[PDB]
RNA sequence: GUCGACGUACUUCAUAGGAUCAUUUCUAUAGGAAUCGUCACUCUUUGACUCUUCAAAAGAGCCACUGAAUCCAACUUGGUUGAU
RNA sequence: CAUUGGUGAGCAGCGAAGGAUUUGGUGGAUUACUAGCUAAUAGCAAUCUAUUUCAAAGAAUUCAAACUUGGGGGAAUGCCUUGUUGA
RNA sequence: UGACGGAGCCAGCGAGUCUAACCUUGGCCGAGAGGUCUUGGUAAUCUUGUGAAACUCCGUCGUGCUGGGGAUAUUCAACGAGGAAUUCCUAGUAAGCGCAAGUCAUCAGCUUGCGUUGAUUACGUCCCUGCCCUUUGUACACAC
């Protein structure tokens, strides 16, 4: 019944599903808040989808992320990818396309690996 | 772009909403008296506002800075932005029309001659003329290249609205009495009119320059004709041999 | 064998190469009439470009590119059936 | 079964993948009640049963 | 190209199943071919079927390298990756160096954290043809697996009497010219299959005076691999030994790439059967 | 295959070894190597042009190579394919280097900047993404699928809003100053943008013919009857003679040949767009023909920093008072073609180089592109060459260090020197030599 | 290690009596059975038609005027001397 | 403890002599506006008839016409073409 | 870059009615085979899924090596990141880390998988060491 949006963030074998919907503004990773995501030195790697665009985008929506697999740093990279492209997809579908591609421009100017992973490797020289 | 709408309130504050989702995006507060004109570039990069305190503000739009502010000598009643040439015209309170460009922020023409309040005005689609209409029951056309008044119409009803077509086809005026829309066609779409001022170098009045035949007797000069005549003369045997049909016609 | 050039060449073979039959054999629709309805409704593209008519003949190398259009409701409901739907790329 | 998993063909639409659904780990939810009944019953049905 | 290669292998094994299914018509069409050739009477089964003869009117115009290697045998040079098992010892890295010097058009790939599915996918979309995976036991290399990549076969061998060029002496540098090949008594159809596998990873058409040679000599299912350079004297031909020597024994040969082990086995070593040690290329 | 446009001969033919059909190509700047990609092979075929052989087959795409382009300056190859990937190949000089850039959806029509710095790809999402080549990261994208006019076909039963047929661009092209992109596709709008600001400059409706198919977005509901539309009814047997009562259209044919053999209306689509290398225009290969869109400076008063004292009257007073440089820069600030022509012809030969040395650097591309578009058809050949010689001598270092500004104004000038002036010089040279022969030698008997 | 002769061993091949149908009458037989300008009723089979399920997908699109149906609120009536 | 599951019981908020959902019919647009009919240089439109008939013109040895056939094989009787006998 | 002592946390492989010790001390029943109970010692990569380790945090210490018979209720073997030489190596690569399996050859004095963490430096050049190719341009223009 609610406007909701589901995205995916992947690094090596971690995978994070982020559901974004309209709400009061709560960002929850694995049930716990976002301010508990260990190893606590990469908590700003998790935070930078919020601090790159401002918390006034997150003031009206609530995100929840479920992260399985991987290790510590692969899980924080999956979390930040899921949060970033979930915010982009929510502003695409339920807010205007101008804020959509402003968010895409800001995340892509920081690093496009917030939005597109580096996936299939190696190179056979 | 169609994304942004701009509201200019009577307490001097421009608010910028998104047309798709309907919410406040930005809010500029420069003027203190009523904002009577807002426009923006064709590249969404510089906006221009004019209030009836007689300041034209020039803002960057992507960055939210102001690029400058220019104080005119009368309260401004109406702005029209010609968007391809980046020239906007202001109907001031001293009954002049100030034509000012937004790139370098200078008053570049100032058109005098109206006797009462300018009700409306509009640019030509090529941006060469500006047609205004005012409460002295008149409609004037100004050639802003030369800066003078090309034509004038005394019309019995006061024309309250003047709009050109976005092609150069039609002028649409709207008067005080009459429930309809009066429609005019510019004869200068079919002929060329002289930009020579009315009141109450014929090639430069008709915006042409017929190129002179040779500039100096010590200068080589080709023929006034097609360039291909030399090649036709030099190789007209092989061109006609090409042009023959492949077998002889049946006579 | 060259007796295929008399025996096994057949209007049914040219008709099995049509787009809804290719679809139904690729399990992309449950029946040939469903495949006809879907490519009439404009869900199916081969390559990049949307194919709109049922009679389109699909060669062997050109059946690797029979997919659904992106932003298809059918593509969305199969992705959301396996809840692999990523709303970033619209489906 | 491993060969069928290798040859799934992910552009596979059925009409029954509207009703049938999938849990969080990706496996198949099979409702253990009915499929001719309903698991949740309405408020007036609960009123009559109670 | 995922879907193209899957459906191409599907169509190939469909055509192969159809060939072995309708291969009776090939030989009975051969029977009526030689019955036309020498005017001898035709059997009852080939005499009463009217459809086969009125297909034989069409089919009278019908008529080495095998199905995986046949498309691009001498047309195109191979491309080989040589990689070790995982976290290899230094003597296995020396041996993988020696095998990449054995095969021309071979490079070597560092192995660690490479899953074999996405390794195979990276190879078979980067365009390599063969993969040689080498396995060790405390330095001593014990196996090599050759996988031909456009869904071709894998031949898995064990290596038995391994002496290495790094192990012997500083005898100089190798030659790296396109060698000549020698295959000694590969007599069965499995022998020709193993020959085609082992020799479509060398460049086609060496020079006639190419002065290095490499021999795969079968001695009771133990392919001795030696490599020699030569210079032809006035009285004989003088052979010097260069590069590694070993004995490889085929224990498996299956019909897919390295990743699955769901591929159909063409041959594998029945070890514990009752008549195991009584026949060769068993 | 390669074509000499002097002797009109196909002198080279390149085939592969695999019997594939080629859909796009790209040549070297220093034309040693041609390169071509197919839509059924996933490889790129690299041929030498001097010899004829197949130099290489580049591999690494896992989808059909939709587009190829060589960078014009540093000669790096950029291919892009339907596996959602643009890929950059360093071919020359011992590298064999591959850099794959992934992108969001499958790519059709890559294009390459004139300086080779960046590459703009068009995707099937509807976007034009622009990437830095050397540091393989995205510089910026345009979202174009909402300023595309996708009409409704007659045969299809889904609206033009919900259609997924043509809301993407199958051909894009850079402007020669590198600042704009023209783009077209299987729709009847061609759109051009400026890549710094990523905003639509202008959208052109390529057809209003209702005889083509994808033109109208909304179809007249009078023509939709109780069984089918009235334009899918074939009234071909109501015809006066047999040769158009005949139906010889084999059924599932799209984009074959011979318009009689397809049974549908010809859809409207642009298959290739290109900018003009010399004069401010673009050509679009639609179904109706090669549509050529061009500006002209005769109309559209667009000044450049004029003030109130800058006037045609003021310019001819400065010309009559023979401040020639002031008259020239007043006409440049007017940007009026007749005034620039009048002042240009009124400057005497004695002081062409003083004026051409004292022209300010912002008015240099204006006088160069004016001299080009004037001198192609003007008769004053020695006057125009004197002006070109004075401009190239006085300010020909600014041009060389600002190449891409004068990249279309200098190509228009050497469209004048080699195409009228060199033909005239050839004629007078042949006359001189035939005179010297006819009077210097011996005709006796 | 190759092909002939002899020897051995193995595989395949029969086709008769009778009836019926096949000629827009008549399949060759007299050993067989059929030539009628409709009236009604019941049972059965089939196909459309409208609505619908598995089970969705797409809407020849907009605006105006006019009628209807359902769910709320509001009012009225019956109702703990008993509604559902 | 989650439902980003169904069915309800209710608040806050929004809130001008009511609100929501669904549907049938008609009208106007869906291409760029020079009026209806007929035997038409004009008549009629309340009607063409009791002038609607004469005259003139007008007829290719083209007295040729399936550019229209699913494939293989045949064609008793047809049909086509050519010759022939008898009138 | 340590040593003690607590705490938080993060994987991917792997599912055959199949998976798994030895030597004793004694009691009771039984004809015997044996059964059942009892008992100490030795060995151990445990046992099928939950779970890893490196890592992260919080208290505490505080950085000059090892021996047996002698002597009370000091002094006689190795070794503190390994010489000359030598081998291998270019991105999820080197290296660190653990966890599973044990697939007809090989392997358990181990082998193969699987994830976790993840760089430095080349990405040029034929100068050295070598290996290879060509020395009519042929293949069709233009140019050299």
Swiss-Prot record, chain A:
Residues with the Phosphothreonine modification: 68
A GO term for molecular function: structural constituent of ribosome
Residue positions, PTM Phosphoserine: 32, 59, 74
Pfam family, one: Ribosomal_S9
Lineage: Eukaryota, Fungi, Dikarya, Ascomycota, Saccharomycotina
Further information: Present with 33800 molecules/cell in log phase SD medium.
Gene3D superfamilies assigned to the protein according to its UniProt record, in alphabetical order: 3.30.230.10
GO biological process: maturation of SSU-rRNA from tricistronic rRNA transcript (SSU-rRNA, 5.8S rRNA, LSU-rRNA); translational initiation
Function, in words: Component of the ribosome, a large ribonucleoprotein complex responsible for the synthesis of proteins in the cell. The small ribosomal subunit (SSU) binds messenger RNAs (mRNAs) and translates the encoded message by selecting cognate aminoacyl-transfer RNA (tRNA) molecules. The large subunit (LSU) contains the ribosomal catalytic site termed the peptidyl transferase center (PTC), which catalyzes the formation of peptide bonds, thereby polymerizing the amino acids delivered by tRNAs into a polypeptide chain.
Entry similarity comment: Belongs to the universal ribosomal protein uS9 family.
GO CC, alphabetical: 90S preribosome; cytosol; cytosolic small ribosomal subunit
Keyword line: Acetylation, Cytoplasm, Isopeptide bond, Phosphoprotein, Ribonucleoprotein, Ribosomal protein, Ubl conjugation
Name of this chain's protein: Small ribosomal subunit protein uS9A
UniProtKB/Swiss-Prot annotation, chain D:
Subcellular locations according to the entry: Nucleus, Nucleolus
Subunit structure: Component of the ribosomal small subunit (SSU) processome composed of at least 40 protein subunits and snoRNA U3. Interacts with snoRNA U3. Interacts with EBP2, FAF1, MPP10, RPS16A and RRP14.
Family stated for the protein in its record: Belongs to the UTP11 family.
Function: Involved in nucleolar processing of pre-18S ribosomal RNA.
Listed name of the protein: U3 small nucleolar RNA-associated protein 11
Residues of the full protein shown: 51 to 100 of 250
UniProtKB/Swiss-Prot annotation, chain E:
Keyword Ribonucleoprotein: yes
GO molecular function terms listed in the Swiss-Prot or TrEMBL record: RNA folding chaperone; rRNA primary transcript binding; single-stranded telomeric DNA binding; snoRNA binding
GO biological-process terms attached to the record: maturation of SSU-rRNA; ribosomal small subunit biogenesis; rRNA processing
Keywords: Nucleus, Ribonucleoprotein, Ribosome biogenesis, rRNA processing
Chain ranges of the Brix domain: 78-259
InterPro entries with a match to the protein in the record: Brix, IMP4/RPF1
Function of the molecule: Required for the early cleavages at sites A0, A1 and A2 during 18S ribosomal pre-RNA processing.
Phenotype upon changing residue 111 to A: No effect on RNA binding
Effect in UniProt of substituting residue 212 to A: Loss of RNA binding
Pfam families in UniProt: Brix
Main location: nucleus
GO CC terms in record: 90S preribosome; Mpp10 complex; nucleolus; nucleoplasm; small-subunit processome
PANTHER family reported for this sequence: U3 SMALL NUCLEOLAR RIBONUCLEOPROTEIN PROTEIN IMP4
The protein's name: U3 small nucleolar ribonucleoprotein protein IMP4
PROSITE patterns (UniProt xref): BRIX
Subcellular compartments: Nucleus, Nucleolus
Subunit field text: Component of a heterotrimeric complex containing IMP3, IMP4 and MPP10. Interacts with MPP10. Component of the ribosomal small subunit (SSU) processome composed of at least 40 protein subunits and snoRNA U3.
Swiss-Prot record, chain F:
Superkingdom per UniProt: Eukaryota
Segment forming the signal sequence: none
Location of the protein in the cell: Nucleus, Nucleolus
WD repeat positions: 17-59, 60-99, 102-141, 164-203, 265-303
Residues that bear Phosphoserine: 240, 253
Chain positions covered by the region annotation Disordered: 242-263
SUBUNIT field: Interacts with snoRNA U3. Interacts with MPP10. Component of the ribosomal small subunit (SSU) processome composed of at least 40 protein subunits and snoRNA U3.
Note: Present with 16700 molecules/cell in log phase SD medium.
General function of this protein: Required for bud-site selection and cell separation. Also involved in nucleolar processing of pre-18S ribosomal RNA.
Family recorded in the similarity comment: Belongs to the WD repeat PWP2 family.
Protein name stated in the entry: Periodic tryptophan protein 2
Gene that encodes the chain: PWP2
First-to-last residue of the parent protein present: 412 to 856 of 923
């Amino acid at each position: 019944a609610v406007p909701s949006v589901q995205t995916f963030g992947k690094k090596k074998s971690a995978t994070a599903v982020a559901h974004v919907k309209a709400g009061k503004g709560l960002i929850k990773v694995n049930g716990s808040p976002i301010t508990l995501v260990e190893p606590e030195i990469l908590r700003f790697k998790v935070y930078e989808p919020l601090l790159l665009v401002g918390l006034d985008k997150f003031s009206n929506i609530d995100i929840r992320v479920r992260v399985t697999g991987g290790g510590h740093v692969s899980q924080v990279y999956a979390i930040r990818q899921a949060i970033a492209k979930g915010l982009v997809a929510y502003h695409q579908k339920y807010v205007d396309e101008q804020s959509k591609n402003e968010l895409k421009k800001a995340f892509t100017s920081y690093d496009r690996t917030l939005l597109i992973a580096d996936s299939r490797r190696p190179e056979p020289k | 772009c169609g994304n942004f709408g701009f509201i200019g309130s009577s307490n001097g504050s421009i608010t910028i909403y998104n047309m798709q989702s309907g919410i406040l995006r930005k809010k500029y507060k420069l003027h203190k008296r009523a904002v009577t004109g807002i426009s923006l570039d064709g590249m969404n990069r510089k906006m221009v506002s004019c209030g009836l305190d007689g300041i034209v503000g020039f803002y960057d739009f992507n960055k939210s800075t102001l690029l400058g502010k220019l104080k005119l000598d009368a309260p401004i009643t109406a702005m029209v932005y010609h968007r391809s040439s980046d020239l906007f015209a202001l109907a001031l309170d001293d009954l002049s029309i100030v034509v000012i460009d937004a790139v370098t922020q200078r008053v570049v023409r100032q058109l005098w001659g109206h006797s009462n309040r300018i009700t409306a005005f509009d640019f030509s689609p090529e941006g060469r003329w500006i047609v205004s209409a005012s409460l002295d029951s008149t409609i004037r056309t100004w050639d802003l290249p030369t800066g003078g008044c090309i034509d004038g119409i005394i019309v019995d009803n006061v024309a309250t609205n003047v709009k050109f077509s976005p092609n150069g086809d039609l002028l649409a005026t709207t008067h005080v009495t009459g429930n309809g829309i009066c429609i005019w066609t510019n004869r200068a779409q079919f002929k060329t009119v002289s930009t020579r001022t009315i009141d109450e170098l014929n090639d430069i009045d008709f915006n042409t320059y017929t190129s002179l035949e040779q500039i100096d007797k010590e200068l080589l000069t080709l023929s006034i004709g097609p360039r291909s005549k030399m090649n036709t003369l030099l190789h007209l045997d092989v061109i006609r041999k090409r042009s023959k049909p492949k077998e002889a016609p049946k006579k | 064998k060259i007796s295929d050039l008399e025996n096994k060449v057949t209007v049914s073979a040219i008709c099995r190469r049509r787009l809804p039959v290719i679809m139904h054999r690729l399990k992309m629709a449950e029946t040939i009439q469903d495949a006809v309805k879907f490519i009439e409704q404009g869900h199916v593209r081969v390559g990049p470009n949307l194919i709109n008519d049922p009679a389109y003949l699909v060669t062997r190398n050109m059946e690797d590119y029979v997919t659904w259009v992106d932003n298809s409701k059918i593509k969305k409901t199969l992705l959301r059936y396996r809840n692999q739907i990523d709303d970033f790329d619209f489906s | 079964l491993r060969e069928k998993a290798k040859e799934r063909n992910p552009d596979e639409y059925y009409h029954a993948m509207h009703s049938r659904k999938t849990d969080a780990k990706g496996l198949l939810i099979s409702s253990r009640h009915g499929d001719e009944e309903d698991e949740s019953l309405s408020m007036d049905q609960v009123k009559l049963l109670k | 190209m995922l879907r193209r290669q899957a459906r191409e292998r599907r169509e190939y094994l469909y055509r192969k199943a159809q060939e072995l299914q309708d291969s009776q018509l090939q030989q009975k069409r051969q029977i009526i071919k030689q019955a036309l050739a020498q005017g001898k009477p035709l059997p009852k089964e080939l005499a009463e079927d009217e459809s086969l003869q009125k297909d034989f009117r069409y089919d009278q115009s019908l008529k080495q390298v095998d199905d995986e290697y046949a498309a691009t045998s001498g047309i195109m040079d191979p491309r080989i990756i040589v990689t070790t098992s995982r976290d290899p010892s230094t003597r296995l890295s020396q041996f993988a160096k020696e095998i990449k010097l054995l095969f021309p058009n071979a490079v070597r790939l560092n192995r660690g954290n490479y899953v074999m599915p996405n390794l195979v996918d990276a190879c078979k979309k980067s365009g390599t043809t063969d993969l040689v995976v080498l396995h060790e036991h405390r330095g001593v290399p014990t196996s090599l697996t050759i996988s031909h990549f456009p869904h071709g076969p894998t031949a898995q061998f064990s290596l038995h009497n391994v002496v290495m060029r790094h192990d012997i002496i500083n005898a100089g540098n190798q030659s790296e010219v396109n060698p000549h090949l020698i295959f000694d008594n590969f007599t069965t159809a499995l022998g020709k299959r193993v020959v085609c596998i082992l020799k479509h990873l060398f460049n086609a058409g060496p020079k006639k005076d190419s002065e290095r040679v490499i021999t795969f000599a079968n001695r009771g299912d133990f392919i001795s691999v030696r490599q020699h350079v030569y210079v032809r004297t006035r009285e004989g031909v003088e052979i010097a030994e260069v590069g590694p020597r070993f004995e490889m024994r085929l224990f498996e040969l299956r019909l897919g790439t390295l990743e699955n082990k769901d591929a159909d086995v063409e041959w594998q070593l029945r070890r514990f059967i009752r008549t195991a040690n009584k026949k060769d290329y068993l | 295959r390669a074509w000499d446009l002097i002797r009109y001969r196909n002198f080279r033919t390149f085939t592969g070894t695999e019997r594939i059909q080629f859909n796009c190509l790209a040549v070297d700047p220093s034309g040693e190597v041609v390169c071509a990609g197919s839509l059924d092979n996933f490889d790129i075929h690299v041929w030498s042009v001097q010899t004829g052989q197949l130099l290489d087959a580049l591999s690494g795409h896992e989808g059909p190579v939709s587009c190829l382009s060589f960078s014009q300056e540093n000669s790096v190859l950029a291919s892009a394919s339907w596996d959602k990937t643009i890929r950059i190949w360093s071919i020359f000089g011992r590298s064999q280097q591959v850099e794959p850039i992934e992108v969001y959806s499958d790519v059709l029509a890559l294009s390459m900047r004139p300086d080779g710095k960046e590459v703009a790809v068009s995707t099937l999402k509807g976007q034009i993404s622009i990437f830095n080549i050397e540091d393989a990261k995205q510089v910026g994208n345009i979202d174009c699928r909402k300023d595309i006019i996708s009409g409704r076909f007659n045969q299809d039963r889904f609206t033009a809003k919900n259609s997924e047929r043509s809301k993407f661009f199958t051909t894009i092209h850079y402007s020669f100053d590198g600042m704009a992109i023209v783009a077209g596709g299987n729709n009847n709008s061609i759109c051009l943008y400026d890549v710094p600001n990523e905003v639509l400059l202008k959208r052109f409706i390529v057809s209003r013919n209702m005889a083509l198919n994808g033109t109208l977005e909304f179809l007249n509901s009078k023509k939709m009857t109780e069984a089918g539309s009235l334009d899918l009814i074939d009234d071909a047997g109501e015809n006066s003679d047999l040769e158009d009562r005949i139906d010889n259209s084999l059924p599932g044919s799209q984009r074959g040949g011979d318009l009689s053999t397809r049974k549908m209306r010809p859809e409207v689509r642009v298959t290739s767009v290109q900018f003009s290398p010399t004069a401010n225009a673009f050509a679009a290969a639609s179904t109706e023909g090669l549509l050529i869109y061009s500006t002209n400076d005769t109309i559209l008063f667009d000044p450049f920093d004029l003030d109130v004292d800058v006037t045609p009257h003021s310019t001819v007073e400065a010309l009559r008072e023979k401040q020639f440089l002031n008259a020239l820069v007043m006409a440049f600030r007017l940007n009026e073609e007749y005034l620039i022509n009048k002042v240009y012809e009124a400057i005497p030969i004695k002081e062409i180089p003083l004026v051409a040395s004292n022209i300010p650097a912002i008015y240099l591309p204006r006088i160069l592109k004016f001299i080009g578009d004037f001198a192609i058809e003007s008769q004053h050949i020695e006057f125009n060459l004197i002006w070109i010689k004075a401009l190239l001598s006085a300010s020909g270092g600014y041009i060389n260090e600002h190449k891409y500004l004068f990249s279309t104004a200098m190509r228009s000038i050497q469209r004048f020197i080699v195409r009228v002036a060199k033909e005239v010089v050839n004629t007078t040279t042949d006359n001189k030599y035939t005179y010297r022969f006819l009077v210097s030698t011996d005709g006796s008997m």
